[PDB]
Write an enzyme that holds these catalytic residues in place. Structure first.
Site, PDB file in Angstrom:
ATOM      1  N   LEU A  97       0.873  -1.165   0.000  1.00  0.00           N
ATOM      2  CA  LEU A  97       0.000   0.000   0.000  1.00  0.00           C
ATOM      3  C   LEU A  97       0.913   1.219   0.000  1.00  0.00           C
ATOM      4  O   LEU A  97       1.559   1.503   1.017  1.00  0.00           O
ATOM      5  CB  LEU A  97      -0.871  -0.014   1.237  1.00  0.00           C
ATOM      6  CG  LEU A  97      -2.194  -0.730   1.269  1.00  0.00           C
ATOM      7  CD1 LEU A  97      -2.816  -0.507   2.621  1.00  0.00           C
ATOM      8  CD2 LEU A  97      -3.022  -0.079   0.239  1.00  0.00           C
ATOM      9  N   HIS A 120       5.198  -6.651  -2.834  1.00  0.00           N
ATOM     10  CA  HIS A 120       4.798  -5.326  -2.376  1.00  0.00           C
ATOM     11  C   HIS A 120       5.047  -4.234  -3.401  1.00  0.00           C
ATOM     12  O   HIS A 120       6.078  -4.224  -4.056  1.00  0.00           O
ATOM     13  CB  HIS A 120       5.537  -4.988  -1.087  1.00  0.00           C
ATOM     14  CG  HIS A 120       5.178  -5.873   0.050  1.00  0.00           C
ATOM     15  ND1 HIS A 120       4.110  -6.740   0.002  1.00  0.00           N
ATOM     16  CD2 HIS A 120       5.751  -6.043   1.258  1.00  0.00           C
ATOM     17  CE1 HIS A 120       4.031  -7.402   1.139  1.00  0.00           C
ATOM     18  NE2 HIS A 120       5.017  -6.998   1.918  1.00  0.00           N
ATOM     19  N   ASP A 165       5.737  -1.269  -2.506  1.00  0.00           N
ATOM     20  CA  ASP A 165       6.879  -0.564  -1.913  1.00  0.00           C
ATOM     21  C   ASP A 165       8.210  -1.097  -2.389  1.00  0.00           C
ATOM     22  O   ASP A 165       9.236  -0.494  -2.066  1.00  0.00           O
ATOM     23  CB  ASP A 165       6.869  -0.629  -0.380  1.00  0.00           C
ATOM     24  CG  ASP A 165       5.845   0.323   0.257  1.00  0.00           C
ATOM     25  OD1 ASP A 165       5.682   1.471  -0.227  1.00  0.00           O
ATOM     26  OD2 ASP A 165       5.197  -0.077   1.268  1.00  0.00           O
ATOM     27  N   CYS A 208      12.921  -6.405  12.378  1.00  0.00           N
ATOM     28  CA  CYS A 208      11.861  -5.414  12.231  1.00  0.00           C
ATOM     29  C   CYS A 208      12.416  -4.144  11.618  1.00  0.00           C
ATOM     30  O   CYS A 208      13.628  -4.011  11.435  1.00  0.00           O
ATOM     31  CB  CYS A 208      11.230  -5.082  13.582  1.00  0.00           C
ATOM     32  SG  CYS A 208      12.400  -4.227  14.655  1.00  0.00           S
TER      33      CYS A 208
HETATM   34  N1  LIG Z   1     -15.951  -2.720  12.028  1.00  0.00           N
HETATM   35  C1  LIG Z   1     -14.521  -2.425  12.121  1.00  0.00           C
HETATM   36  C2  LIG Z   1     -14.439  -0.984  12.626  1.00  0.00           C
HETATM   37  O1  LIG Z   1     -14.829  -0.065  11.932  1.00  0.00           O
HETATM   38  N2  LIG Z   1     -13.880  -0.777  13.824  1.00  0.00           N
HETATM   39  C3  LIG Z   1     -13.400  -1.853  14.705  1.00  0.00           C
HETATM   40  C4  LIG Z   1     -13.427  -1.219  16.073  1.00  0.00           C
HETATM   41  C5  LIG Z   1     -13.063   0.227  15.776  1.00  0.00           C
HETATM   42  C6  LIG Z   1     -13.650   0.543  14.412  1.00  0.00           C
HETATM   43  C7  LIG Z   1     -13.713  -2.517  10.829  1.00  0.00           C
HETATM   44  C8  LIG Z   1     -12.302  -1.974  11.018  1.00  0.00           C
HETATM   45  C9  LIG Z   1     -11.578  -2.026   9.683  1.00  0.00           C
HETATM   46  N3  LIG Z   1     -11.548  -3.395   9.160  1.00  0.00           N
HETATM   47  C10 LIG Z   1     -10.594  -3.702   8.188  1.00  0.00           C
HETATM   48  N4  LIG Z   1     -11.053  -3.983   6.953  1.00  0.00           N
HETATM   49  C11 LIG Z   1     -10.153  -4.095   5.960  1.00  0.00           C
HETATM   50  C12 LIG Z   1      -8.809  -3.948   6.116  1.00  0.00           C
HETATM   51  C13 LIG Z   1      -8.277  -3.685   7.396  1.00  0.00           C
HETATM   52  C14 LIG Z   1      -6.879  -3.515   7.626  1.00  0.00           C
HETATM   53  C15 LIG Z   1      -5.903  -3.639   6.564  1.00  0.00           C
HETATM   54  N5  LIG Z   1      -5.004  -4.634   6.657  1.00  0.00           N
HETATM   55  C16 LIG Z   1      -4.068  -4.735   5.705  1.00  0.00           C
HETATM   56  C17 LIG Z   1      -4.003  -3.873   4.658  1.00  0.00           C
HETATM   57 CL1  LIG Z   1      -2.695  -3.962   3.524  1.00  0.00          CL
HETATM   58  C18 LIG Z   1      -4.931  -2.869   4.534  1.00  0.00           C
HETATM   59  C19 LIG Z   1      -5.892  -2.743   5.514  1.00  0.00           C
HETATM   60 CL2  LIG Z   1      -7.037  -1.449   5.410  1.00  0.00          CL
HETATM   61  C20 LIG Z   1      -6.433  -3.239   8.897  1.00  0.00           C
HETATM   62  C21 LIG Z   1      -7.303  -3.145   9.967  1.00  0.00           C
HETATM   63  C22 LIG Z   1      -8.643  -3.310   9.781  1.00  0.00           C
HETATM   64  C23 LIG Z   1      -9.178  -3.570   8.492  1.00  0.00           C
HETATM   65  C24 LIG Z   1     -12.908  -3.902   8.967  1.00  0.00           C
HETATM   66  C25 LIG Z   1     -13.654  -3.939  10.292  1.00  0.00           C
HETATM   67 CA    CA Z   2       3.912   1.869   1.818  1.00  0.00          CA
END
Ligand code: A1BZK
Ligand code: CA
Length: 569
Positions: free
Chosen positions: A332, A393, A395, A551
Site C-alpha cells: 500500500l 509489495h 513498496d 523489524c
Molecule cells: N468494524 C470495524 C471498525 O470499523 N472498527 C473496529 C473497532 C473500531 C472501528 C472494521 C475496522 C476495519 N476493518 C478492516 N477492513 C479491511 C482492512 C483492514 C486492515 C488492513 N489490513 C491490511 C491492509 Cl494492507 C490494509 C488494511 Cl485497510 C487493517 C485493519 C482493519 C481492516 C474492517 C472492520
Molecule cells: Ca507503503
C-alpha cells in the site's frame, strides 16, 4: 430555511387545536368540511397567513400558516376562518394553534460550530464538497473524552404544560443502530436501542448529545448515520401516539485517510542502525521513540473539531488502533495530491499491488482489504501489478519524494536498465574488475556478461514498465515527474523477482532528508557509483541523501490541510 409541516384540517363544526413547530410551514384545509362561496381569514398577531382580504372557495387556494414565536401556553395563538357567501351570514371555523420550538442543532455546515437544522436547505441528505451539508462523526478506536465526539443539541421552547400531552423521542434507524452511540448530558441511542424517550420539560430548554461512530465505512456500511427527533401527540389516551413533527441530522463517519511520503513527518517510531535513523531524524527536525514492523500503517481520521491519528494492523501510542503476502501495508503506497484529466485527488490515491490477471498461481490482495480501502472513497485506490515480485509489495519498486518544482513531487521507480547503463559506463572505462558488495561477491564485468541476469532484468523492466504506464494514466503523470533509481533484480523461487542488492526505492522519506538503503555498490575512485548516481538524481530537487543499513520503523506524517469532506469522489 423554511421546512414543511403537516396539514391542519379545520372544520366549522368543532374547533381544532393543532401544534405548529417553529420553522415549518403549515398547510390549512379550508375547502374540506367547509359549507357553501367565499371566505375571509383573520388570525392572532403571531400567525403569518399567506394565501396563494377576500377569497373564494376554489380548491386552488394554498392557505399556508407559519408561526412567528413559540407559545406561552396551549392555544396561545388562534386562527378563525369565515365561510360567508352571497346570501349566507359568515360561518366561523376555529383553530387554536400552539407554537413550539424544536430544533436539532449539530455541525451540519462543517465549520466546527453547531448550527440549527433550519440553516441548511436539505437537512436530511448528506452532500460532499464545499457549499455542502452533513455533519461528521469520528470512530471510537479505543470527561475530556468528549473531545473525540460530535456535538448535537436540542433546543426546545414550548409551553410549561406542553409535554403533558406530547413527548419527544430520539431515534436512529435499526440498520444504523449498531454503528453509533449517543450520550446525553447516559447512552440514549445505542447499538441495541434504536429509539429512546427524551424527558424534556416545558419552557425553554437546551439539552446536549454527544455522538461517537462505532465503525468505519465499508461494503456493509456506506458511512451515513441519521439521528432523528420526533414530536409525538400523546394527548388522547385512547388512540395511539400520533407523530406531528420529525426532524433529523445526517452524520457521515470520517473515513480512514493514509499519508503519502510527501506529507511532512511528525513522529518516527522504532521497536545498531537505529543510530543512523536518529541522525537522519535529527537533521529533519522530527520526533523519534524506541520501545525495548511494517505490518501496520499510521493514518488519520478527521472532523472539523478533532483530528487524530489511527494505526491499522493486518502496544503503541498514536491515540488510536484498529485491527497471503499481498495483504500487507507494505503493499500500500499513497500518491501525493494529484489531478488527472481534470479530476482532483487532493488527498492522493492509494496504490496497491495485485496480479495482472487471476490464475491458479496468481496472488491478489484479500478482497475485503480492497473493498475497505475503496469504501473510504476519499483516496480512490489504484490496482497495480506486483505479483511478479517474490514478496509482492508495491513498496518494492516505487516511492515518492518531495520536489520543489513541477507538480511538487517526483515518483521514484526502480530501474534495471538505469543500473545496467551505469555499470556499462563503468566497464567501458576499464572498471569491470570493480567488485559489487547475501554474501557472494561479483565484479561488474561478470554481472554485465551474465546473459541470464540480463533477461531477468529485461523482464523485470517490462513489469515495472507496465506499472509505469498504469501510474501515468491513473495519476495523470508526465515523464518529467518520474525518476528512475538504478536497481538490479534476480528471479528466485517460482520465477518471482527479488532485489539483487539492497532495494533503494524502499527508502525513508522524512521531508527532504532521504535515508536510502546502502547498496554496497562497486567502489570507483573512492566513490560508489550507485550512490553518486542517486545523489545526482535527487539532490537537484533538493533532497538530502543518506545511506544506512538493511523489524523496521514506521513514520507518522502530518495530515493534509485539505479536509476530506470537501472532495467530491
Ligand atoms: N468494524 C470495524 C471498525 O470499523 N472498527 C473496529 C473497532 C473500531 C472501528 C472494521 C475496522 C476495519 N476493518 C478492516 N477492513 C479491511 C482492512 C483492514 C486492515 C488492513 N489490513 C491490511 C491492509 Cl494492507 C490494509 C488494511 Cl485497510 C487493517 C485493519 C482493519 C481492516 C474492517 C472492520
Ligand atoms: Ca507503503
Amino acid at each position: 430555511f423554511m421546512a414543511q409541516g403537516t396539514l391542519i384540517r379545520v372544520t366549522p363544526e368543532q374547533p381544532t387545536h393543532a401544534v405548529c413547530v417553529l420553522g415549518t410551514l403549515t398547510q390549512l384545509d379550508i375547502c374540506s368540511s367547509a359549507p357553501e362561496t367565499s371566505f375571509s381569514i383573520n388570525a392572532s398577531p403571531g400567525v403569518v397567513v399567506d394565501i396563494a382580504s377576500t377569497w373564494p372557495l376554489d380548491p386552488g387556494v394554498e392557505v399556508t400558516l407559519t408561526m412567528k414565536a413559540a407559545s406561552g401556553s396551549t392555544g396561545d395563538q388562534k386562527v378563525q376562518i369565515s365561510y360567508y357567501g352571497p346570501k349566507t351570514p359568515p360561518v366561523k371555523a376555529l383553530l387554536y394553534l400552539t407554537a413550539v420550538e424544536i430544533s436539532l442543532c449539530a455541525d451540519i455546515t462543517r465549520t466546527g460550530k453547531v448550527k440549527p437544522t433550519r440553516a441548511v436547505k436539505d437537512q436530511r441528505t448528506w452532500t460532499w464538497g464545499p457549499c455542502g451539508q452533513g455533519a461528521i462523526l469520528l470512530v471510537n478506536c479505543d470527561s475530556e473524552d468528549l473531545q473525540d465526539m460530535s456535538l448535537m443539541t436540542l433546543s426546545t421552547k414550548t409551553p410549561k404544560d406542553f409535554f403533558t400531552n406530547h413527548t419527544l423521542v430520539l431515534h436512529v434507524a435499526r440498520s444504523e443502530m449498531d454503528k453509533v452511540r449517543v450520550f446525553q448530558a447516559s447512552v440514549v441511542l445505542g447499538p441495541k436501542w434504536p429509539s429512546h424517550y427524551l424527558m424534556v420539560p416545558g419552557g425553554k430548554h437546551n439539552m446536549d448529545f454527544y455522538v461517537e461512530a462505532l465503525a468505519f465505512p465499508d461494503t456493509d456500511f456506506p458511512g451515513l448515520i441519521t439521528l432523528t427527533i420526533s414530536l409525538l401527540d400523546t394527548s388522547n389516551l385512547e388512540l395511539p401516539e400520533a407523530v406531528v413533527f420529525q426532524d433529523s441530522v445526517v452524520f457521515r463517519v470520517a473515513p480512514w485517510i493514509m499519508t503519502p511520503n510527501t506529507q511532512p513527518p511528525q513522529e518516527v517510531y522504532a521497536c545498531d542502525f537505529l543510530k543512523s535513523v536518529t541522525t537522519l531524524a535529527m537533521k529533519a527536525k522530527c520526533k523519534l521513540t524506541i520501545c525495548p514492523q511494517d505490518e501496520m500503517e499510521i493514518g488519520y481520521i478527521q472532523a472539523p473539531h478533532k483530528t487524530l491519528p489511527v494505526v491499522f494492523d493486518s502496544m503503541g501510542p498514536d491515540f488510536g488502533y484498529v485491527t497471503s503476502g499481498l495483504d500487507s501495508f507494505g503493499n500500500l503506497e499513497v500518491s501525493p495530491p494529484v489531478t488527472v484529466r481534470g479530476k482532483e485527488y487532493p488527498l492522493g490515491r492509494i496504490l496497491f499491488g495485485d496480479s495482472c490477471y487471476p490464475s491458479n498461481d496468481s496472488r491478489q490482495m484479500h478482497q475485503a482489504l480492497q473493498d475497505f480501502l475503496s469504501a473510504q472513497q476519499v483516496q480512490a485506490p489504484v490496482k497495480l501489478y506486483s505479483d511478479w515480485l517474490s514478496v509482492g509489495h508495491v513498496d518494492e519498486f516505487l516511492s515518492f519524494v518531495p520536489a520543489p518544482d513541477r507538480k511538487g513531487f517526483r515518483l521514484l521507480l526502480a530501474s534495471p536498465r538505469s543500473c545496467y547503463k551505469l555499470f556499462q559506463e563503468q566497464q567501458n572505462e576499464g572498471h569491470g574488475e570493480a567488485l559489487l558488495f547475501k554474501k557472494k561477491q561479483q565484479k561488474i564485468k561478470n554481472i554485465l556478461s551474465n546473459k541470464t541476469l540480463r533477461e531477468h532484468n529485461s523482464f523485470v523492466e517490462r513489469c515495472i514498465d507496465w506499472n509505469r504506464e498504469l501510474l501515468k494514466r491513473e495519476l495523470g503523470l508526465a515523464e518529467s515527474d518520474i525518476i528512475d533509481i538504478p536497481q538490479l533484480f534476480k528471479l528466485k523461487e517460482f520465477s518471482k523477482a527479488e532485489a539483487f542488492f539492497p532495494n533503494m526505492v524502499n527508502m525513508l522519506v522524512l521531508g527532504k532528508h532521504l535515508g536510502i538503503p546502502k547498496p554496497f555498490g562497486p567502489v570507483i575512485n573512492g566513490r560508489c557509483c550507485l550512490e553518486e548516481k542517486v545523489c545526482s538524481l535527487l539532490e537537484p530537487l533538493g533532497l538530502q541523501c543518506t545511506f544506512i543499513n538493511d523489524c523496521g520503523t514506521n513514520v507518522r506524517r502530518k495530515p493534509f490541510s485539505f479536509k476530506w469532506w470537501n472532495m467530491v469522489p
